[PDB]
Symmetry: C5
Subunit: 69 residues, 5 copies
């Protein structure tokens, strides 16, 4: 079902996961669930224009978790 998430679904997920400031970057880059499942580490860390601290946790604890589950 993550593969079916809209951009707004992705924004809502990261808002509810505790990254409401960084969630808007997924809207800015038009990242839906299908694109989310295609992202690699450098895409999150350097491609979203977000601070490195949250970016590291967004990838390792959510994007990577989503791609593996």
């Amino acid at each position: 079902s993550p593969v079916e998430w809209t951009v707004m679904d992705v924004v809502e997920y990261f808002t509810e996961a505790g990254f409401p400031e960084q969630a808007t970057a997924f809207q800015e880059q038009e990242i839906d669930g299908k694109s989310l499942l295609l992202m690699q580490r450098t895409d999150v860390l350097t491609g979203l224009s977000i601070r490195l601290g949250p970016a590291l946790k967004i990838y390792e604890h959510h994007i990577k978790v989503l791609q593996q589950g």
Copy 2:
């Protein structure tokens, strides 16, 4: 055949494929079919100045598909 595509052909491909806003980047970077078949992942995600969501699908389901065909 992609290898013979002009820059106009590459722009038309991504427009017809549903990326009309991103197709502009292929004109800006003067990417013909021969250059298209040389592109790697980071060239699409960071070399076109396009949004990451569309860039991820452009590489995975189009540039990669054309190169493997």
Copy 3:
């Protein structure tokens, strides 16, 4: 343990370590101890906007050491 360090704990650590000018970058990027243990080499050298000389020592003699201890 480092995994529980706050952002201000991280800034304090690098201040005591002799990088007080670079310590502000960890505050800027909101890097706590959990984020610190997720960092890779390029994150320190290109993601903190600090000088390269201090960045190389910060990674080799502190971040690496903390991740390996």
Copy 4:
């Protein structure tokens, strides 16, 4: 042999090779024949500030060919 080419020699080569617009970037970056033989793929695609399309051909059909000869 290319290893002896001056910066101007490199500029004239790419001018004669059909990349006159991109040839000035080798003057800007002060790339002589010895530097040319040290370049890797990302150096051409991101280090010359040239368009991606021409840069891909410049690496694949010229710089790589000179390094492998």
Copy 5:
């Protein structure tokens, strides 16, 4: 002994090696001998804000040589 070099020692080295314009970047990035021995290729090519041609020689013929000697 290279590991004991100060920042200006490094600046002096690259000036005498024939890179006086690029030697200033080692002062700007506060790179002493200890930091010089930690540098990798991409640090020289993208982290010093120097022209690519000289940067390629600086890494291959000097920084790599010092690290291996």
